[PDB]
């Protein structure tokens, strides 16, 4: 019923205002609590802050001095603004709905209770990289094949992570296998997607490899054939 979807730049220069947004699908926004969570490599999950149903804010003191969370009720969008970003600010920024719980141990009249918040539905994450380097679209090269056979699609020299790859614009989905990237010494990632198809399908089921690298708005297509 309720799903969330993040969206961000992916690349932000050092000492610059990072800005992400998050869309709610199915439910409203001004009747729930929403939290921003990031997860850096090596470091654990870090709670950034949250916003109420009355649009009241409360930031983590770890980054209180430079985080501003907002909300737009015209639709179901809530944003995040983080300035003065450093190299340690690159992470997968998640977006989740917080649910207020009231743990009561003594007398509510004396205030012998405390509120706790928990995230019950999360987003999918937005990869964000803080680097002085500039974005670069990839270079797609086909890998033609020769029981069954396997063909590929080589996505080399792009920055930064990630890159989505679908086969036949989304039609081909069985046997697809996209492999994690590789950070070469030059500083650019290199991917590789491969599907296993029946050998007899070589003539002539068209195999269109789709590649999208949003940090450079450079989508490309390429066909494979022996």
């Amino acid at each position: 019923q309720v799903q969330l979807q993040e969206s961000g730049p992916g690349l932000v220069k050092p000492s610059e205002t990072l800005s992400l947004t998050c869309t709610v699908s199915g439910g409203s926004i001004s009747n729930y609590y929403w939290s921003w969570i990031r997860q850096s490599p090596g470091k654990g999950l870090e709670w950034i802050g949250y916003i109420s149903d009355s649009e009241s804010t409360n930031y983590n003191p770890s980054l209180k001095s430079r985080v501003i969370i907002s909300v737009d009720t015209s639709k179901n969008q809530l944003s995040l603004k983080l300035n003065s970003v450093t190299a340690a600010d690159s992470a997968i920024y998640y977006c989740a709905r917080a649910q207020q719980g009231k743990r009561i141990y003594g007398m509510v009249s004396f205030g012998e209770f405390f509120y706790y918040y928990y995230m019950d539905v999360w987003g999918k994450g937005t990869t964000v990289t803080v680097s002085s380097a500039s974005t670069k679209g990839p270079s797609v090269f086909p890998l033609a094949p020769s029981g069954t056979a396997a063909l590929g699609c080589l996505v080399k020299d792009y920055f930064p992570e990630p890159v989505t790859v679908s086969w036949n614009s989304g039609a081909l989905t069985s046997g697809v296998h996209t492999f994690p990237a590789v950070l070469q010494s030059s500083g650019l990632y290199s991917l590789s997607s491969v599907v296993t198809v029946p050998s007899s399908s070589l003539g002539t089921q068209t195999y269109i490899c789709n590649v999208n690298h949003k940090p450079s708005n450079t989508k490309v297509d390429k066909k494979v054939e022996p």
Partner: protein, 211 residues
């Protein structure tokens, strides 16, 4: 934050004790997180679990004070490998901003799986660009650790190789990629190129040649 490991045999019952013990009445949340993926709230109140989570995930309620918060995962499977966070709230301490430590759960006694190596020669369009890359794609292997070895003909080649650290797949197996970069002349002037993938005790070779 720091990571504390835990090994549980396949099919056993995992007992993940929380990182910090409560000073008063508690309300503890349990999150499941595998890196590169959104967390999964397993239990929100001391024992209340949301929908879409099996009954084998259980937490300890706050009946009497002194009971430690432990997440119990009965009947562990290879999918239960993830980081487990214990978001601890209590009447005494302040506002729980930190999710706490991270219990790295690995499931022992999983079936050994040999890799599926697939080697591709340099594409024509890449060679037209005066560059050439050999790619060695390894997948469906467990335990997730392999060693690649690139050889020009029979002599070894280590200058120009880039290999991925293994990554868990959706079927609980691992995948790795190896990229040998070389000039298009070194691809023509040699007879054949091979990628040796050694996994566990065995080694598998896939070779390619410009023909």
């Amino acid at each position: 934050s720091y990571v504390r490991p835990l090994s549980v045999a396949l099919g056993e019952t995992a007992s993940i004790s929380c990182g910090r013990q409560a000073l008063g009445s508690r309300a503890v949340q349990w999150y499941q997180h595998r890196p590169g993926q959104a967390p999964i709230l397993l239990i929100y109140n001391n024992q209340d679990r949301p929908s879409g989570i099996p009954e084998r995930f259980s937490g300890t309620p706050d009946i009497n004070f002194g009971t430690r918060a432990t997440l119990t995962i009965s009947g562990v499977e290879a999918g239960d490998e993830a980081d487990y966070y214990c978001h601890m709230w209590d009447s005494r301490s302040g506002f729980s901003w930190s999710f706490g430590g991270a219990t790295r759960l690995t499931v022992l006694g999983q079936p050994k799986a040999a890799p599926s190596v697939t080697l591709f020669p340099p594409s024509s369009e890449e060679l037209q660009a005066n560059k050439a890359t050999l790619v060695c794609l390894i997948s469906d292997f467990y335990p997730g650790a392999v060693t690649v070895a690139w050889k020009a003909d029979s002599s070894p080649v280590k200058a120009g190789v880039e290999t991925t650290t293994p990554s868990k797949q959706s079927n609980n197996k691992y995948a790795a990629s190896s990229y040998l970069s070389l000039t298009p002349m070194q691809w023509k002037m040699h007879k054949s190129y091979s990628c040796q993938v050694t996994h566990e005790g065995s080694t598998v070779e896939k070779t390619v040649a410009p023909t």
